[PDB]
Write a protein that binds this DNA or RNA. Structure first.
Ligand SMILES: [Mg+2]
Ligand SMILES: [Zn+2]
Ligand SMILES: [Zn+2]
Ligand SMILES: [Zn+2]
Lengths: 112, 554, 171, 97, 270, 87, 107, 177
RNA sequence: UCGACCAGGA
DNA sequence: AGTACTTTCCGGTCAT
DNA sequence: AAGTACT
């Protein structure tokens, strides 16, 4: 029910201006804020504390502070984070990169 | 990238294991003793002493040598060095924990303060979350200040069971500057205040149990609490703290290269006290100095004021400060960079380009280049551009051959000569219809960056179509815009197939198109409509001629 | 002693060769970078078996250049001596510090003082030898050696062997 | 010019995967370093000529990789190391999922 | 913020919305798996309107001189009147359009019937119209079975999720429900013949199109939805240039922060 | 790893090619083509790689396979051949 | 289920989790005057057999953690009395598609 | 390089590299329990000379064949017969294989894939470990001592009489020249 | 030639 | 309830 | 400047 409100309110902030945003968006956000458990805030205090990798949170509001307690608790980073890769110079699993491409030697013969 | 082939297989990083350096490793890794604090001048004689920077580490003066590693400057990343401290020191950023850990374990024997025996503890030992056990465990035993030797088991509170021993009361602790102090309460009365020497803490940790580590948010292999205390100090190599030479007979050393210089000094001075007139505690007045420097070197924006100002009152750039958000490494070097193949100027509308185009001024199109690969399909056209030169427009300015070597088209005694080789690359000029990424910051839209078709035009401005104005959110009152040029046959694809303005027309941000018709065109499209408005032959004809796709049917 | 280990390799193929008979090329290159190789963990790679059923799997295309990368899984005949391994081979070189036997693709060397005593070293011989009461060791003479210690290096493996134990010497 | 945070976010939204990389690597930083397949570090003393590779300490010469990462990132790492923190670069996942 | 807090969220190939942990955030992007781009405000006619009018429009009774399709519309008009085996499909249909009504009135209590929905049906037909030069004069050639049985055969193919099982195929029905209401609303026997004189040709076309068009409006696994949704909110937040409540920008800030002490607290009790 | 490899049957992803997929196939193919790779369609005179790719991809004569990973890591393999190309 | 009026003594409550398997719950009168589940906003939840759950997981290839969670003390979690591990199925109305099926595990 | 069917999870501290001795302790890459490509388990594969000579020739041969389907589109006597099989299906710069064929073909102890078969069927009743079940096949041995001493991994795994019988049936199968 | 400030542009 | 602590694209000058 | 979270 909270979600329902949290959304309703957020929706009103955008409607009071006479603008329009398709549900899905405000929803998605209102959802991200809720799933975890209750009201997770969109601030260094909340979300940027989740189980997400280090390098990722690392790029927002606490950096070193976060990096320090990373090597100290021997964290392990998946490198599934958009950020993660951006920092490494690798292709992020995003749209164009949400999959791999291969040369099927087989089909490469029926073609001739 | 980097150049020069390596018989080393190449992969992508898949995981990042975070840890803490073990003095022993630090040493193994190092290729430099690092004893002297000086820089070079082997008695003014220019070079580098086997003291600081390059006692075998990286280099300068444009000279191969990197421990024969040669390759020189560009290619030889740095090679860490080390420097054996005198006495254990904290890690400016870990102090917080180092303390919170002691409050979790009692000295002398060094072991937990709450076994499976205490139930409230059990619950805190099932929680699988390093950040959370350790945040609950602590809250539980920060209070108890008596290393219990006998506790009431899962049975009668009458019968007492035994475990580890040494009831030596536990001292509460507080933080004063960079040192830990605590009081031991004596009953019969009054406290007992003494400073917890690093040498001591370090030890108590060394003895903490294997399953004790882990129980508390740690890791037997990558980060044993005992490592939060610095015994051996890694010495970042030039590239981390490069110089800056005004030719020769001058200096140019970097901030860091000084704090080490300091840390080093402050280190030696100490040593020369424990092997000489050691007025016992006239030393711990110079051991705090090491703890300081080796602290400020990493973090220099603490609570205990002393900024460690460097002669001239300039603050001192601590390592931490280099990563701190915005304008720094992480956020301003990795998440966002300066880049090549880019240009920017003033934008002005032009009611004559198709929506998806963008007017690029010859000036730029002759500057920006696109690497094309010599192929039978283009050989001809390509060789022509080359011949053409880098000054005429449709031309090019660089041909690179398999032998990884750049032929600078504007100088090379063979500019006019040259026959291309299938496989060679011919960095040519941007030409009519080279998809490009156009954009106007602040970028807060998919649309703040769109792909247009390059239309080389005269005069100095990016001439964008009107209707694609409201998406970038731009006017011509002196607004500037950025242009980025793709580089790989596949990169373009990524622009042209997902970023092309035509595509952006209808926006998901509000399930409605996001570009329309404005100003004249709009204002005018109304008038031109009205019942009252009629047009006569002579003109109806020109108008017809104007819609390029007119079927030619008056 | 000779083994038949199951190995695999990764070859990076340029789009160029993305022809009709690619498989062919791959295999071919597999062979260029294996047959004749050497490691400490595999020792001498000598010959790729079952040339025909070589598994290529689908190779994946890298992502900056079209080069694809296939994990060619194969099987082959290997051979890596060990310390304490007894083997016989043909002598090749013989000096005043010992003779060097050649156990297959490898060369085991035996020190003058790692042989017996009654076996001296004759210099003014042609070709160079080592004489005994009843034995004579020189070039072609076949020996049976006990590899005392192994030393891996580059693209080869050397080792020192003795002939001071029993049932060790000529044949 | 500068391809800042916002300019990234847009490409991410576009799903313009490779392009992003291209801006961040090839058209800027892009650097090639060598790793220890054992202790995920830059230790490796690569002589890229006599193909020697070593890495005394974790002591190698055999298990070594090569990677491409923004020079700024290399630095990020080296900097972290000087702060006594270890960022291991592993070329294969072992934690599954 | 908004952005950095949703970077990692994208639709994965299973048609679920997750982040870098794999934590499902939405099981179906936007509670429907449709890409915002392919959507328009349509009207669920089945909702508004007097209980009276509803009948006069969707109700067909083959057992009645005044509630049957006048044979001037259907080719097989006269030979149908009275047929009982048809009046069962004809009643099934109606008991459904009715179930629909109540359902919608349970979701959109406001009565508001205009909503963003994939596949613009109004137009898809408008073309069916002048594409076959359909004359509002001569009679159709659709079997009542033709209509009712194809419309049903349509919904079967509007696949969002695919899965080969119950739990999944069950979500399928869910994430389509609303769209269909609108579907059944516009392809109701009476309508299909009295309002838009469709021929078998037209109809079969209208169907094929609705399916394909729908299938396009699905979301592409790959879309970095998070960054999207973020900007989509944060963008019009910049354009905010400024009954006695807390307001816009400052309020939004208040919400995202989840502040305990909000300037305006209010509370409306009915 | 084959437990992470899903059968051609039991397959469940979209039967249609995602815009990113094709976007990348074309690119990737183009790239290779510009690399002097072999072209499986008669160039009706074309000479631009991404153009040839657009052609290869329409006669579905592109020897590529899109491997679609799932959140848990298991993947599904599809062929440009199979994949329907609406857009 | 025990319904107290103004409160229970902190000496008493520490006697509920002392007799497993059996379980006990504490509810205040004033909190039960109105059924929260009847509220316009709160959509209907549902318990899932440790059969229906082991399924939901297998069908999405989800690990327990990646699942949306509900508070052990969440109002409705109590109304039905969940247990650390039980999954609730949340079915609500939607302005994009009539009904939306969601799941909440417990912590 | 050329990875080997077993991803040993190396967690930083690589230090325990035991010795290599006829204590049947061969590198981790040669335990008695290694893994086959299909994913199955399989006994190590120990080859005694002349048994190898046959496995190599066998492949080097069947190579020259599938090397022509595609082409369209007595002691001293075998030295010459093999040199050719190489200068046809080998890299020619595999100076090792050459030298491995000489050695392998000179010190070999069997000529028939039938004789090598019996050798195996015999030794494979010993329960002995592959490496021994190799050396025994490629090393002349008259006494249980010449044996149990040049293959010290035997010592207590087989009664001298028994091992002596085996040595008897070996010289009896040992093809002439 | 790392930087600190100030003025200013959309 | 009080104390403590981090965050808030693109000339000229002076000097380290 | 403010706000929260942390002690
Ligand atoms: Mg402006
Ligand atoms: Zn070097
Ligand atoms: Zn104690
Ligand atoms: Zn190493």
């Amino acid at each position: 029910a909270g979600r329902a409100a949290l959304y309703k309110e957020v929706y009103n902030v955008i409607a009071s201006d006479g603008s329009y945003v398709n549900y899905r968006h405000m929803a998605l956000l209102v959802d991200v804020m809720t799933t975890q458990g209750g009201l997770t805030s969109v601030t260094r205090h909340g979300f940027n504390r989740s189980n997400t990798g280090a390098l990722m949170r690392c790029s927002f509001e606490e950096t070193v502070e976060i990096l320090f307690e990373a090597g100290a608790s021997a964290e392990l980073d998946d490198c599934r984070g958009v950020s993660e890769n951006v920092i490494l110079g690798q292709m992020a699993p995003i749209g164009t990169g949400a999959f791999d491409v291969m040369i099927d030697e087989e089909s490469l013969v029926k073609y001739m | 990238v980097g150049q020069q082939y390596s018989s080393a297989p190449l992969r992508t990083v898949k995981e990042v294991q975070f840890g803490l350096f073990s003095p022993e490793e630090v040493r193994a890794i190092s290729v430099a003793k690092i004893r002297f604090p000086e820089t070079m001048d082997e008695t003014q004689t220019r070079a580098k002493i086997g003291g600081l920077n390059d006692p075998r580490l990286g280099s300068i003066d444009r000279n191969l040598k990197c421990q024969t590693c040669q390759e020189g400057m560009n290619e030889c990343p740095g090679h860490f060095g080390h420097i054996d401290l005198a006495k254990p020191v904290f890690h400016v950023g870990f102090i917080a924990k180092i303390k919170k850990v002691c409050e979790c374990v009692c000295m002398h024997c060094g072991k937990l303060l709450l076994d499976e025996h205490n139930e409230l503890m059990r619950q805190a030992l099932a929680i699988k979350d390093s950040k959370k056990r350790f945040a609950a465990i602590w809250t539980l035993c920060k209070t108890k200040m008596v290393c219990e030797t006998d506790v009431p088991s899962e049975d009668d509170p009458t019968q007492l069971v035994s475990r580890g021993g040494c009831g030596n009361t536990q001292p509460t602790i507080r933080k004063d500057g960079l040192k830990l102090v605590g009081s031991w309460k004596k009953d019969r009365d009054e406290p007992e205040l003494r400073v917890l020497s690093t040498e001591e803490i370090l030890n108590i940790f060394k003895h903490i149990s294997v399953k004790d580590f882990t129980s508390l948010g740690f890791n037997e292999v990558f980060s044993r609490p005992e490592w939060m205390i610095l015994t051996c100090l890694p010495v970042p190599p030039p590239p981390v703290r490069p110089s800056i030479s005004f030719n020769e007979s001058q200096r140019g050393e970097d901030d860091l290269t000084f704090k080490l210089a300091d840390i080093l000094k402050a280190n030696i001075s100490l040593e020369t006290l424990e092997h000489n007139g050691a007025p016992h505690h006239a030393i711990e007045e110079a051991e705090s100095l090491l703890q300081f420097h080796v602290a400020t070197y990493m973090d220099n924006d603490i609570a205990g004021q002393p900024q460690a100002l460097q002669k001239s009152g300039r603050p001192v750039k601590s390592i931490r400060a280099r990563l701190k958000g915005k304008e720094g490494r992480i956020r301003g070097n990795l998440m966002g960079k300066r880049v090549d193949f880019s240009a920017r100027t003033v934008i002005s509308g032009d009611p004559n380009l198709e929506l998806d185009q963008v007017g690029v001024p010859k000036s730029i199109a002759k500057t920006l280049t696109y690497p094309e690969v010599v192929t039978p399909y283009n050989i001809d056209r390509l060789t022509q551009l080359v011949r053409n030169g880098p000054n005429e427009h449709p031309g090019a300015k660089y041909v690179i051959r398999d032998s990884g070597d750049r032929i600078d088209l504007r100088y090379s005694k063979r500019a006019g000569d040259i026959q291309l080789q299938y496989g060679w690359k011919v960095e040519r000029h941007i030409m009519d219809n080279d998809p490009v990424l156009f954009n106007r910051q602040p970028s807060l839209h998919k649309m703040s960056m769109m792909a247009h078709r390059v239309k080389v035009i005269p005069y100095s401005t990016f001439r964008l179509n009107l209707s694609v104005t409201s998406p970038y959110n731009a006017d011509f009152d002196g607004d500037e815009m950025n242009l980025h040029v793709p580089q790989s046959e596949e990169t373009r694809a990524e622009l042209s197939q997902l970023c092309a303005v035509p595509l952006q027309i209808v926006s998901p941000q509000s399930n409605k198109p996001c570009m329309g018709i404005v100003q004249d065109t709009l204002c005018g499209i109304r008038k031109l409509t009205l019942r009252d408005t009629f047009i006569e032959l002579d003109q109806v004809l020109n108008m017809l001629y104007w819609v390029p796709d007119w079927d030619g049917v008056i | 002693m000779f083994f038949i280990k199951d190995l695999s390799l990764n070859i990076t193929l340029h789009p160029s060769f993305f022809g009709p008979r690619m498989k062919q090329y791959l295999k071919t290159k597999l062979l260029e970078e294996v047959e004749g190789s050497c490691t400490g963990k595999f020792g001498y790679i000598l010959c790729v078996l079952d040339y025909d059923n070589i598994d290529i799997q689908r190779g994946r295309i890298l992502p900056t250049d079209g080069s694809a990368e296939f994990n060619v899984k194969y099987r082959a005949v290997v051979f890596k001596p060990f310390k304490g391994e007894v083997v016989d081979g043909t002598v090749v070189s013989c000096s005043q510090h010992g003779f060097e036997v050649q156990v297959g693709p490898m060369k085991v060397f035996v020190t003058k003082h790692l042989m017996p005593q009654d076996l001296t070293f004759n210099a003014g011989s042609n070709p160079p030898s080592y004489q005994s009461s009843e034995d004579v060791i020189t070039i072609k003479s076949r020996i049976r050696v006990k590899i005392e210690g192994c030393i891996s290096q580059v693209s080869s493996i050397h080792a020192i062997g003795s002939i001071k134990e029993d049932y060790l010497g000529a044949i | 010019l500068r391809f800042g945070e916002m300019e990234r976010d847009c490409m991410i939204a576009h799903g313009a995967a490779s392009f992003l990389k291209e801006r961040l690597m090839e058209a800027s930083d892009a650097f090639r370093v060598h790793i220890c397949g054992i202790c995920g570090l830059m230790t490796v003393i690569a002589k890229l000529n006599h193909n020697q590779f070593e890495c005394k300490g974790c002591d190698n010469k055999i298990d070594i990789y090569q990677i491409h990462i923004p020079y700024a990132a290399k630095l990020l790492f080296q900097e972290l190391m000087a702060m006594n923190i270890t960022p291991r670069l592993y070329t294969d996942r072992s934690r599954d999922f | 913020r908004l952005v950095k807090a949703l970077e990692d969220i994208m639709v994965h190939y299973d048609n679920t919305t997750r982040n870098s942990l794999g934590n499902v955030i939405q099981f179906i992007y936007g509670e429907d798996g449709m890409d915002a781009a392919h959507i328009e405000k349509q009207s669920l006619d089945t909702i508004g309107g007097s209980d009276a009018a509803f009948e006069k429009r969707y109700r067909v009774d083959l057992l009645n001189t005044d509630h049957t399709l006048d044979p001037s519309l259907l080719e097989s008009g006269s030979e149908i009147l009275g047929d009982l085996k048809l009046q069962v499909l004809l009643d099934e249909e109606y008991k459904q359009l009715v179930k629909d009504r109540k359902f919608l009135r349970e979701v959109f209590v406001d009565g508001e019937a205009n909503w963003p929905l994939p596949v613009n049906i109004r137009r898809i037909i408008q073309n069916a119209q002048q594409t076959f030069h359909i004359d509002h004069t001569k009679p159709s050639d659709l079997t009542i079975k033709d209509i009712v049985l194809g419309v049903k055969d349509l919904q079967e193919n509007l696949l969002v999720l695919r899965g080969k099982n119950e739990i999944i195929q069950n979500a399928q029905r869910d994430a389509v429900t609303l769209f269909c209401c609108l579907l059944r609303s516009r392809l109701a026997t009476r309508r299909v013949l009295q309002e838009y004189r469709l021929t078998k040709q037209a109809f079969d076309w209208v169907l094929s199109n609705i399916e394909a068009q729908f299938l396009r409006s699905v979301v592409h696994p790959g879309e970095m939805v998070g960054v999207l949704a973020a900007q989509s909110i944060g963008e019009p937040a910049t354009q905010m240039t400024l009954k006695k409540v807390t307001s816009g920008v400052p309020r939004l800030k208040e919400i995202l922060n989840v502040a305990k002490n909000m300037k305006t607290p209010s509370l409306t009790v009915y | 790893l084959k437990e992470k490899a899903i059968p051609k049957d039991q397959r469940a992803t979209t039967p249609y090619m995602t815009k990113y997929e094709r976007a990348r196939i074309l690119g990737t193919r183009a790239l290779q083509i510009s690399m002097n790779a072999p072209v499986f369609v008669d160039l009706e005179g074309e000479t631009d790689p991404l153009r040839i790719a657009m052609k290869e991809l329409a006669e579905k004569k592109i020897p590529l396979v899109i491997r679609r990973y799932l959140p848990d890591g298991s993947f599904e393999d599809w062929s440009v051949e199979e994949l329907i190309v609406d857009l | 289920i025990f319904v107290y009026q103004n409160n229970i003594t902190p000496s008493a409550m520490k006697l509920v989790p002392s007799i497993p398997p059996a379980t006990i719950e504490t509810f205040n009168e004033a909190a039960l005057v109105v059924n929260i589940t009847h509220h316009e906003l709160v959509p209907k939840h549902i318990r899932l057999s440790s059969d229906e759950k082991r399924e939901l997981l297998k069908r999405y290839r989800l690990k327990e953690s990646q699942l949306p969670r509900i508070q052990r003390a969440d109002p409705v979690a109590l109304y039905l009395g969940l247990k650390r591990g039980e999954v609730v199925k949340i079915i609500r109305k939607s302005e994009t598609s009539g009904r939306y099926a969601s799941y909440r595990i417990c912590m | 390089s050329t990875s080997t069917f077993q991803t040993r999870r190396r967690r930083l501290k690589k230090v325990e590299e035991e010795e290599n001795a006829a204590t049947l302790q061969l590198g981790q890459e040669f335990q008695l329990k290694q893994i086959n490509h299909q994913g199955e388990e399989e006994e190590l594969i120990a080859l005694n000379l002349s048994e190898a000579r046959l496995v190599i020739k066998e492949a080097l041969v069947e190579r020259r064949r599938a090397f022509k389907r595609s082409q369209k589109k007595t002691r001293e006597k075998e030295l010459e017969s093999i040199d050719v099989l190489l200068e046809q299906t080998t890299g020619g710069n595999n100076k090792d294989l050459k030298n491995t064929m000489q050695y392998l073909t000179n010190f070999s102890r069997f000529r028939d894939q039938e004789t090598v078969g019996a050798v195996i069927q015999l030794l494979k009743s010993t329960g002995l470990h592959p490496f021994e079940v190799a050396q025994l096949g490629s090393l002349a041995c008259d006494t249980a001592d010449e044996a149990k001493t040049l293959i010290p991994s035997l010592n207590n795994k087989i009664s001298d009489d028994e091992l002596e019988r085996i040595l008897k049936e070996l010289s009896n199968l040992e093809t002439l020249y």
